[PDB]
Design a protein around this ligand. Structure first.
Ligand SMILES: C[C@@H]1Cc2cc(F)cc(C(N)=O)c2O1
Ligand SMILES: [Zn+2]
Ligand SMILES: [Zn+2]
Lengths: 222, 456
DNA sequence: GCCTACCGGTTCGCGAACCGGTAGGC
DNA sequence: GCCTACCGGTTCGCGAACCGGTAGGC
């Protein structure tokens, strides 16, 4: 959908379009989506985050133009936002929300790499299956949905198509199939969901849940 | 089908088939939301895979020799199911999420004007250009004959869209039919998204496309065939295929003056965008059209009326006569349902020739259409069954050719008078329409060739 | 009757090699 | 669309070593 794309390198395999060296794993990298000559589909032209700003591209507002911006770590978002460039109650709720937005961002990130330290992928796969959740393709995406599951709740099936809703940037988009020919287009900020049920098998669940985690709903960007 | 020349082994090894089922399938997949609109041709010559975005250089291919012939079946049926979702044999096909869907592939002794008539109606490259504006795939549609059952389903999808549009159905409902249609009929939009079939005239435009596309494949069916023996001339071979007796009415003839009067007189005051100019008059006599029309020579109120259509259609109109729209097709565009439409004015009919400043010449018909006891209508109304005793329908217009100046012709009433006000003015039509719901009621008399003079 | 240097054959341990399914790359 | 580097899971190959049977010496 978007022209650009930013994420942490899912593998240290892809090369950089400008300098032509291997972009290392788990490193901040940016892309520009182009039409592939080989097949009918868009393809990311990966750049080193350093090399991205010398090709001549100037993203005015990263949060609205670049994809995967909200999924980044809070301090890394500010690096993109700054590098892109180179009343009382109104400002209070505005400022206090950004406090709660950071609070939510690095809460999930603390929870994400906590599970990466303790649990293997197969544990995280069987975590989602137990909660009646579709197991996604990808390592990063699995713990992203487990962390989403634990903090907010196990997502109930879709109203019409009975598919799996997934958090994407600014809302929960339905990824199911209303029919064989077309994909479902349900979208919401307040989806239906029961409470996340961790199985008995968790000797470090008391440690992860002890990180000051209370009941709260997903907060979104302005 | 034959071998795809993208392999490079087209005139070397034949495409294989196991008894009945031919090991060759051309798949397609479109998602209007994503914008993807792709093809995937699979063959078994060696196995050959072709893929990309339909109607563009985007894509690639892989020719690959097999270890053996039984390994070919293994590699073919596996690749097939991996891409399409289903097995190679099936009773009825079923589409699967993000999987592909298979498309169902199958010295001349005559006058100079008559030779030009064949020259005009059998130039198929002119018919190809005609489809370019519709955005039909130009690449492999002439060699790749799209199936008859396929096009009927494509018609059915269009008729489902109009039904969905009429009663303001869901966007998903519309999205599906738009996806379904462009999958079933491969279009060329280049690098931009296939547009949603949401309008009332968008379905009509795509309905007209199928009607024209059909007649081109019919024009091919005539051209390809016969008995290639060294005796007759090339133009004569195509003349005999038309299955009609065409004659040139001389300009000095007294009946020719009537037609030129009928052209000059019955030009519409509102259609002042162009000016007609009769190049030729052809007297036309179809094979056994008098045998089927004998019944309706007993019928009263017979009128010699205009009927225009694309120069591409006249290849099929001569061979099969004037035909009613199929039952699968949508009723959109038609004022009073599916049937043969006629006009008393040459101009109103002449618009259906679809001529431009670059393509000046155009063909229009004159048929002795047995109207009989007429069912007169003012406003548009999609009828299924006619009222009792009625053999035709009439759309009453504001302007009508003078009924006190209606000249006769071989026992046929020719209304070649100039325009005056009608009896009733509570209608939503400006000019008259004459509709017959039976191909037997029409009998084509004259074929004209008209030059259009615009001002640009 | 002992002891023991020598030999054929089975087991054991551990890293190389193999492999099918797949997430990431273009 | 297809290619391929990566992952875990099992097998495979080969030398150390373990072990029982034995025949030359005293
Ligand atoms: C089928 C359309 C509707 C219509 C009305 C009419 F008065 C004339 C024509 C025509 N084909 O000349 C026509 O073609
Ligand atoms: Zn670089
Ligand atoms: Zn849904």
């Amino acid at each position: 959908d978007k022209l650009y794309r930013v994420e942490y390198a899912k593998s240290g395999r892809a090369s950089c379009k400008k300098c032509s060296e291997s972009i290392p794993k788990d490193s901040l990298r940016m892309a520009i989506m182009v039409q592939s000559p080989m097949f009918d589909g868009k393809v990311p032209h990966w750049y080193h985050f350093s090399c991205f700003w010398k090709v001549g591209h100037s993203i005015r507002h990263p949060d609205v133009e670049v994809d995967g911006f909200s999924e980044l770590r809070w301090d890394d978002q500010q690096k993109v936002k700054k590098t892109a460039e180179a009343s009382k109650k109104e400002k209070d709720k505005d400022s206090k929300l950004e406090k709660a937005l950071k609070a939510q961002n690095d809460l999930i990130w603390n929870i994400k790499d906590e599970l990466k330290k303790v649990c293997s992928t197969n544990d995280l796969k069987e975590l989602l299956i137990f909660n009646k959740q579709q197991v996604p393709s990808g390592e990063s995406a699995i713990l992203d949905r487990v962390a989403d599951g634990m903090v907010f709740g196990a997502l109930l099936p879709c109203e019409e198509c009975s598919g799996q809703l997934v958090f994407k940037s600014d809302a929960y988009y339905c990824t199911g199939d209303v029919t064989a020919w077309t994909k479902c287009m349900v979208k919401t900020q307040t989806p239906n969901r029961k409470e996340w049920v961790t199985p008995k098998e968790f000797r470090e669940i008391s440690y992860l849940k002890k990180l000051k985690v209370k009941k709260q709903d997903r907060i979104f960007p302005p | 089908a034959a071998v795809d020349p993208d392999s490079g082994l087209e005139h070397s090894a034949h495409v294989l088939e196991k008894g009945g089922k031919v090991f060759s399938a051309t798949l397609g997949l479109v998602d209007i939301v994503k914008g993807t609109n792709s093809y995937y041709k699979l063959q078994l010559l060696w196995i050959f895979r072709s893929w990309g975005r339909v109607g563009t250089v985007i894509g690639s291919n892989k020719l690959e020799q097999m270890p053996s012939k039984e390994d070919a079946i293994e590699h073919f049926m596996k690749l097939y199911e991996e891409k399409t979702g289903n097995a190679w044999h099936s009773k009825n096909f079923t589409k699967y999420p993000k999987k592909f869907y298979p498309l169902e592939i199958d010295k001349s002794k005559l006058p100079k004007p008559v030779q030009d008539l064949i020259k005009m109606i059998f130039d198929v490259e002119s018919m190809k250009k005609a489809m370019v504006e519709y955005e039909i795939d130009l690449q492999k549609m002439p060699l790749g004959k799209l199936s008859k059952r396929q096009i009927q389903a494509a018609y059915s999808i269009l008729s489902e869209v109009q039904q969905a549009v009429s009663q303001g159905s869901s966007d998903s409902q519309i999205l599906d039919l738009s996806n379904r249609f462009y999958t079933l009929i491969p279009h060329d939009f280049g690098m931009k998204k296939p547009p949603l079939l949401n309008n009332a005239d968008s379905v009509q435009a795509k309905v007209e496309m199928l009607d024209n596309l059909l007649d081109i494949e019919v024009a091919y069916s005539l051209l390809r065939g016969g008995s290639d023996d060294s005796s007759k001339d090339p133009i004569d071979v195509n003349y005999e295929k038309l299955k009609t007796d065409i004659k040139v009415v001389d300009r000095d003839s007294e009946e020719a003056e009537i037609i030129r009067k009928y052209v000059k007189n019955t030009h519409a005051t509102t259609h002042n965008a162009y000016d007609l100019e009769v190049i030729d008059i052809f007297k036309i006599e179809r094979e056994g059209e008098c045998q089927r029309y004998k019944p309706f020579k007993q019928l009263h109120n017979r009128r010699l009326l205009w009927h225009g259509s694309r120069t591409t259609n006249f290849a099929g109109i001569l061979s099969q006569g004037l035909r009613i729209a199929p039952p699968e097709a949508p009723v959109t565009g038609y004022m009073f349902g599916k049937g043969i439409y006629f006009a008393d004015m040459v101009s109103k009919s002449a618009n259906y020739c679809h001529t431009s400043q670059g393509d000046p010449i155009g063909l229009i018909l004159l048929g002795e259409v047995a109207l009989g006891n007429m069912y007169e209508l003012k406003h548009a109304s999609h009828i299924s069954k006619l009222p009792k005793g009625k053999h035709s329908v009439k759309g009453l217009g504001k302007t009508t050719p003078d009924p006190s100046a209606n000249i006769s012709l071989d026992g046929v009433d020719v209304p070649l008078g100039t325009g005056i006000s009608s009896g009733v003015n509570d209608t939503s039509l400006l000019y008259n329409e004459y509709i017959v719901y039976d191909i037997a009621q029409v009998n084509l008399k004259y074929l004209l060739k008209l030059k259009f003079n615009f001002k640009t």
